[PDB]
Amino acid sequence: MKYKRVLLKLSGEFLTRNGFGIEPEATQALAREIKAAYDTGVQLAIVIGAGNLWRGARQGVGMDRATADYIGMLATIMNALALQDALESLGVPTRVQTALTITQVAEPYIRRRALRHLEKERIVIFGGGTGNPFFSTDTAAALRALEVGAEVVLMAKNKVDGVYSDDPRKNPEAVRFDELTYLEVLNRGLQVMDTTAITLCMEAGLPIVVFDIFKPGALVGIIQGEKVGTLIH
Amino acid sequence: MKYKRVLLKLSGEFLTRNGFGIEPEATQALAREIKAAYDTGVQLAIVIGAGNLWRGARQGVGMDRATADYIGMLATIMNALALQDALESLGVPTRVQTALTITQVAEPYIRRRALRHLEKERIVIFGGGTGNPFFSTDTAAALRALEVGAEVVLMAKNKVDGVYSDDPRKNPEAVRFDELTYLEVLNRGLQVMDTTAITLCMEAGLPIVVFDIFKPGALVGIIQGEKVGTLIH
Amino acid sequence: MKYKRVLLKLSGEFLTRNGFGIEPEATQALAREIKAAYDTGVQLAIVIGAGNLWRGARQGVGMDRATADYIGMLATIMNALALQDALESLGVPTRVQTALTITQVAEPYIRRRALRHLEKERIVIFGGGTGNPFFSTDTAAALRALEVGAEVVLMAKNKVDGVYSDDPRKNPEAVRFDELTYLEVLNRGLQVMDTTAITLCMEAGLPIVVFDIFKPGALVGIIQGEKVGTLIH
Amino acid sequence: MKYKRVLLKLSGEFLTRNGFGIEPEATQALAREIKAAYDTGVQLAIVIGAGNLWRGARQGVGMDRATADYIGMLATIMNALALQDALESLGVPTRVQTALTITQVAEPYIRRRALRHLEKERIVIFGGGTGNPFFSTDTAAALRALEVGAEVVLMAKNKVDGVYSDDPRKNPEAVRFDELTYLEVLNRGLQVMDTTAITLCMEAGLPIVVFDIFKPGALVGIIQGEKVGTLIH
Amino acid sequence: MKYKRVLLKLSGEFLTRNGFGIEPEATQALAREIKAAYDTGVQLAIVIGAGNLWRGARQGVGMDRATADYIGMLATIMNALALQDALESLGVPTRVQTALTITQVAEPYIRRRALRHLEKERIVIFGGGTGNPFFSTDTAAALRALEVGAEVVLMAKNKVDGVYSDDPRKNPEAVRFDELTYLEVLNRGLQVMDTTAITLCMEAGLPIVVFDIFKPGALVGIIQGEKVGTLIH
Amino acid sequence: MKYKRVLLKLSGEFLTRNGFGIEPEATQALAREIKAAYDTGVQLAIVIGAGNLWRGARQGVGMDRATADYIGMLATIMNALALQDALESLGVPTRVQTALTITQVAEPYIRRRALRHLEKERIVIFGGGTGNPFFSTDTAAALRALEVGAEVVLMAKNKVDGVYSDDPRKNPEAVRFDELTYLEVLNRGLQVMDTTAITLCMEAGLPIVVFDIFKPGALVGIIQGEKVGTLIH
Ligand SMILES: Nc1ncnc2c1ncn2[C@@H]1O[C@H](COP(=O)(O)OP(=O)(O)O)[C@@H](O)[C@H]1O
Ligand SMILES: Nc1ncnc2c1ncn2[C@@H]1O[C@H](COP(=O)(O)OP(=O)(O)O)[C@@H](O)[C@H]1O
Ligand SMILES: Nc1ncnc2c1ncn2[C@@H]1O[C@H](COP(=O)(O)OP(=O)(O)O)[C@@H](O)[C@H]1O
Ligand SMILES: Nc1ncnc2c1ncn2[C@@H]1O[C@H](COP(=O)(O)OP(=O)(O)O)[C@@H](O)[C@H]1O
Ligand SMILES: Nc1ncnc2c1ncn2[C@@H]1O[C@H](COP(=O)(O)OP(=O)(O)O)[C@@H](O)[C@H]1O
Ligand SMILES: Nc1ncnc2c1ncn2[C@@H]1O[C@H](COP(=O)(O)OP(=O)(O)O)[C@@H](O)[C@H]1O
Ligand SMILES: O=c1ccn([C@@H]2O[C@H](COP(=O)(O)OP(=O)(O)O)[C@@H](O)[C@H]2O)c(=O)[nH]1
Ligand SMILES: O=c1ccn([C@@H]2O[C@H](COP(=O)(O)OP(=O)(O)O)[C@@H](O)[C@H]2O)c(=O)[nH]1
Ligand SMILES: O=c1ccn([C@@H]2O[C@H](COP(=O)(O)OP(=O)(O)O)[C@@H](O)[C@H]2O)c(=O)[nH]1
Ligand SMILES: O=c1ccn([C@@H]2O[C@H](COP(=O)(O)OP(=O)(O)O)[C@@H](O)[C@H]2O)c(=O)[nH]1
Ligand SMILES: O=c1ccn([C@@H]2O[C@H](COP(=O)(O)OP(=O)(O)O)[C@@H](O)[C@H]2O)c(=O)[nH]1
Ligand SMILES: O=c1ccn([C@@H]2O[C@H](COP(=O)(O)OP(=O)(O)O)[C@@H](O)[C@H]2O)c(=O)[nH]1
Ligand SMILES: [Mg+2]
Ligand SMILES: [Mg+2]
Ligand SMILES: [Mg+2]
Ligand SMILES: [Mg+2]
């Protein structure tokens, strides 16, 4: 194995086939991909987004960005709980920790508890992002990777298989990169993930792999050492 | 004014026109109805549901009913926050209290903070139901009515204008009731609301009016003393 | 064994023989009955009332019913802590969870900590009711039964051995029922328990047995499959 | 006025005429004494005991002192809430802060909030003692006096009007002291209050007056400068 | 006035003249500078660092960076409490909000409460950073600026009056910039602040002014519209 | 072994050789002494002070003693976290419980959890004192000893090997006592520890041993039954 512990960042869109909502069949498919990774023996922490449920203050009337972001963080917790149940259906031991403390619903985020969960071969799903507005779960992925000592952030990005010279769904001439420096991402103004998540990984020397989780073998390949997707380092 | 303080129970469906999501124009139209009631000078507490965002364990995989309920409670808080912004857009002073404590996002349910807010002519929106699974927001509406000393529960029901002999959406021949007793609702097995919400109001002699909030003038009518919808008492 | 997991509802009066207080010998006698049921191997959750310590707003001066209810909830936690010590005296593994969060004193109600404790053959005593005013512990017993997946609610009622046509303490001519339906309880206006607790169990098809815990063998009888008391179903 | 801000320590026994429980008439009488002090214009913080409800581990079976103390702290909060309602019945503005955080029921203890309450001419009742076992509310009285900057602790002791050379209810030859040093109290082994409360006041030079609150004029006299009871200094 | 609401980022070092500790005369001197800016009428939010009290994991034995960062977050709260007292002793109304919830000590970070405080012309001091390890006080300054709608982040740098081509206390030949872009800071590898704080401001278009707070008139100059220090925008 | 469970009170000064701060080699040296006592098999609970980081209100401007004490409580938690890391790096299983609840950083003080930890042969480090101002770490040592059922409080005094007739670093003619009573300490006006800590131990009959932890073999000596230091009993 190239990696013993990883942070897998997932789009909330992966929980539906139809753009919106939480759907059982899509959640099962996503669980099956995660179990494929779990079965390699890697230690697995996850950050889950909420694009399937909530886009932002465009949906509100007179809505601050902070308020819209809090709504989105609650949505990521909805997804976290749904994903945990799907993984438990496969018998994969799973815990959820949320960046907003909601005692009746899930454990709060507690570093020493997250570490013990990973050491006991459990998947830890992080809901709620970082708990702060003005981030996406991209930044929560970088932060939680650093907090659990993951060796790489695996960004399972919706509808792309890597980082491109441009948004490949707005420019068919876009070209995929094998490798990039953090600064190259910033200088070229690429919009594949929060620039704040880039700089957080930059400061720690934490590598990022952007890939297509629904390409069979891709996630297991990354874990086992294959070249897959785009490496930011 | 017949009533000085009312609890208004709203379906989460009122925030969308397309089945799913939170939508600006639907939320704004709902806020305008609430503003008409507020402008009468009545004191106004609201309980909001989550059916525009979450439909229960049918959407999960191997999901407890309790877990589905906690996800719904999170969804009601998302709706409460969106509704608050919409009302504040219109200049209506509004507070949100949640049955689950989420410090950054809203204040917790605290009985005499809620009493003080109503006394200060603010709308109090209660998110999170009662904080317990195995209720709907119907029972949360009954509970919160008793807690704030509301004089009646105004049940704004999605797509009906009162209580009928049968589900009017399955039975075109159903007949509307002008009045019912609590026991009559239970013995006829009508499915307009939680039977638990029925008996809570029954134990207290707290009346319920089931009505159509989008019939212009209905809500303000009830507040002023007109006969609108079905009275359960 | 007919039942694998039961919820046992206890009056706070069982902790005293003199109307008021918490008394060692009464608490110990109650703990011995609970130990007999535990020794059958059934999984056992308990909800405890507060009538030995608090009788409601009649004891206050200008006191809300909600405020009286919150005081009663505090009193149920006092009883839960006393009962736990008594059971631990007898070697019975016991946990206390409270509906109101009081960190130093007991763990908070958390649904799958409670599920894990029962799986580990510990008794879980729930203090604080549901955490909401306008319920009795009767409704808390119904709620907690549903939450832990109990198969029946065992209503140990103070000074009666079943449900009667009338209050047997006011009507010496009252007759005991072997069986009732939920609706029959409501329509006959019997005052054995919260009508809200009745309808909660009714909605779930959760049966209730009203019985005398101090009739030797009654509790263990019910657990083993004997006909004891009144079945509501 | 001799004093601008005082801490009044009250026995839980003052809430009953009959040894046990909370009784409306006794609570009103106690409220009327407190209002007499309030009407002088002094700033008034209160610590309330629980001897009317809970004595200790003698009432438990296999009961630790710590557990018995937690039960007693919950009882002081019951009394605090009852006393607040009685004072509110007289129109005296009153707040309750508890050393155990119980959000739905009362404010948590927060120093800056307690100070603002006193500055706004409200009575603050402290329930829960210090939140730590192994104290009595005597020690909570000394601690809360220091925390709010009270100039004296007024110990309204049950059934005595001062400090005596011996327990005056076990030795009719006991003599009352006008004045005592902290060390004199310790050296003579007097049992009128926690020795820990003595030393806490010793270290701060905080004077203590032990007196009979039901002697008409006594409490107002202390506040206005008269010699009443026993001074420990 | 050029700016109506600002976020002032301060080093923990400003609370000492001797490299380490909290010292009264330095804290008072810092409070007098803050009071001068308050006296312009600007709404003022502060983020305070910890360098006077804690450097990081090299002070620990086997200490991971996350643990060191939590220790520094505690230190920032220590400084916030000391700064609040100095400011209050000058009669400036001040509130402290902490990213880690410690009820007894200060109010939690709550965005709507912080907005009300600023509108009521109080200084809000933010302690605890963001509550997340791997985030710096520079990043907390950026975040809290966004959250309170400050128009600019004023980075009071220790012993430096702007951004330079190189660390000036390491290269006497370094040249100061009047103006830079966010990307210029990142590309030139400048170490004036956390790159994550840069990119957060970049994404919002929030301008940063790096300046020397102990150059008399500089802070007030920036507030009134003068050109002081270095503008990053 | 004379003692099976002890409470070890340590000064914050033991974490530095230079009067102030947290330093790795002093912290490691302190951890090696603690590990030597752990290796005897005794169950070991620790209370840690703050003097290496915070002296009190003379470091503040207009700073009341309560605020200074909360600042010191934060410092004791900083030290607890650093001590836990040094101990863990020696392979000693260690848990931290804090009197102020800071979820992200350490578990809250919970008596039943602390007992389980000691029974599972873990060191429990108590940070935050008691959570109350005006209580000292000496008083916290006494309290936490009572709460965990320690058989003795071991007061590791800074630069002193027992109790003396006078402050020895102020009177070279002072004479050491082998033994004293609680009352002798109070009557002689000795300043070795908080008088409130003395009286708390007096009331429980809990013995105190004042000793020099950096006299090699002394801590282990006390645990194995030797006569070391001064016994207060
Ligand atoms: N340079 C780029 N390379 C790859 N994807 C890009 C780039 N710029 C923008 N994108 C967009 O980023 C999207 C992923 O972002 P988002 O919709 O938020 O997915 P996720 O929810 O997985 O973060 C891709 O679908 C793509 O349209
Ligand atoms: N007897 C009845 N009278 C009226 N409506 C009924 C009755 N029985 C069932 N219903 C159905 O209940 C629906 C309201 O349920 P729900 O979707 O939960 O509304 P809400 O979301 O407002 O609570 C109505 O739209 C109607 O289809
Ligand atoms: N129909 C009935 N059958 C039995 N008991 C009844 C009935 N109606 C009222 N009761 C009264 O309800 C009491 C139980 O109420 P309560 O004191 O709350 O018991 P518990 O404390 O066990 O809930 C019985 O002692 C009885 O006096
Ligand atoms: N030396 C003493 N002087 C006065 N009262 C004493 C003394 N020693 C013991 N006491 C007892 O202390 C009692 C007050 O303590 P307690 O019953 O706890 O009252 P409270 O509940 O007000 O503290 C008095 O009723 C008295 O019996
Ligand atoms: N390009 C640069 N321009 C200005 N200062 C720099 C630069 N590179 C490094 N620094 C250093 O950054 C320091 C400011 O950071 P720091 O000491 O952490 O102050 P603060 O604690 O307020 O952030 C300056 O004292 C300076 O020595
Ligand atoms: N009678 C006494 N015997 C011993 N030490 C004393 C006495 N009186 C005062 N002290 C002082 O108390 C100090 C111990 O307290 P302190 O410095 O606070 O250590 P710690 O921080 O461990 O409590 C000793 O260093 C000593 O100088
Ligand atoms: O640290 C965080 C994480 C999330 N969010 C909000 O919650 C949403 C989570 O959705 P995200 O964009 O991360 O999901 P994805 O696009 O991958 O489905 C964000 O968009 C923000 O609105 C936030 O404010 N801070
Ligand atoms: O007290 C409550 C309130 C709500 N809920 C859950 O949250 C959902 C909220 O949706 P609801 O049916 O109340 O909304 P509506 O149908 O009125 O839009 C419920 O269905 C439950 O799953 C709950 O468990 N308890
Ligand atoms: O969910 C609950 C449970 C309890 N209580 C209050 O706490 C008291 C507990 O006494 P109960 O009647 O349940 O005890 P019992 O009569 O069984 O001894 C109730 O009366 C209410 O005042 C409440 O408000 N809600
Ligand atoms: O700081 C405190 C205050 C109270 N208690 C407990 O709660 C009871 C409160 O009753 P108290 O003796 O103070 O009341 P009084 O005798 O004045 O009625 C005590 O006896 C203890 O059991 C405690 O453990 N710590
Ligand atoms: O959001 C934050 C803010 C601060 N810190 C920690 O607390 C320290 C704050 O002191 P810093 O050196 O940033 O402040 P300065 O005094 O240098 O401005 C940081 O170094 C980190 O260790 C953190 O972990 N997260
Ligand atoms: O229960 C407690 C314990 C500690 N403290 C505060 O925290 C400091 C802890 O450091 P201390 O000087 O007591 O410890 P040392 O290092 O001297 O043993 C005290 O001085 C108080 O300011 C407090 O307020 N309450
Ligand atoms: Mg995204
Ligand atoms: Mg609906
Ligand atoms: Mg009863
Ligand atoms: Mg007492």
Residue numbers in the entry:
A (entry chain A), B (entry chain C), C (entry chain C), D (entry chain A), E (entry chain B), F (entry chain B): 1 to 233
What is the paper's account of this structure, in its own sentences?
We determined the crystal structure of UMP kinase of an extreme thermophile Thermus thermophilus HB8 in ADP-UDP–bound form at 2.6-Å resolution. The subunit of ttUMPK has an α/β-fold with a eight-stranded β-sheet surrounded by eight α-helices and one 310 helix. UDP is located among the β1-αA, β2-αC and β4-αE loops, as is common among other bacterial UMPK structures. The magnesium ion is coordinated by four oxygen atoms from the α- and β-phosphates of ADP as well as the β-phosphate of UDP and one water molecule (2.9 Å), and it may be coordinated by the side chain of Ser136 (3.4 Å). Furthermore, in the UDP-ADP form of ttUMPK, the corresponding loop is closer to the active site than the UDP form of ecUMPK (magenta). This motion enables Asp167, Arg169 and Tyr164 to interact with the bound ADP.
Nucleoside monophosphate (NMP) kinases are ubiquitous enzymes in the biosynthesis and regeneration of ribonucleoside and deoxyribonucleoside triphosphates. Prokaryotic UMPKs have no sequence similarity to other known NMP kinases but have significant sequence and structural similarity to amino acid kinases including aspartokinases and glutamate kinases. One hexamer comprises chains A, B and C, whereas the other two comprise chains D, E, F, G, H and I. The hexamer has the architecture of a trimer of dimers, which is common to other bacterial UMPKs.
